[PDB]
Amino acid sequence: EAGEECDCGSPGNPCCDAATCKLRQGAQCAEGLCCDQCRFMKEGTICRRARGDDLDDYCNGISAGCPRNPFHA
Numbered sequence: 759e760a761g762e763e764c765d766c767g768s769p770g771n772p773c774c775d776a777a778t779c780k781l782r783q784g785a786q787c788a789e790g791l792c793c794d795q796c797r798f799m800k801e802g803t804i805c806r807r808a809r810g811d812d813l814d815d816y817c818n819g820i821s822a823g824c825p826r827n828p829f830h831a
Contacts, residue, residue: 761804761814764789769807769824772796779822787817791824798822805829 760767766774766781767789774781779794786797790806803817805824818825 760809762789
């Protein structure tokens with residue numbers, strides 16, 4: 759758990775995939791950025807670049823990517 763509810767929320771692990779960005783759900787900016795068709799908000803949602811001990815961000819123009827504005831402090 760980083761920002762939002764979702765264990766599979768990882769930048770590249772579209773809030774679940776257990777194989778490859780292709781979750782029948784739709785990790786569109788879940789606990790962590792998504793990479794599957796899932797889709798993405800566009801407004802400061804959750805670009806969470808990482809978790810571990812830190813690393814985060816908000817969703818903007820995040821078609822499975824991440825904006826260029828400062829979010830994680």
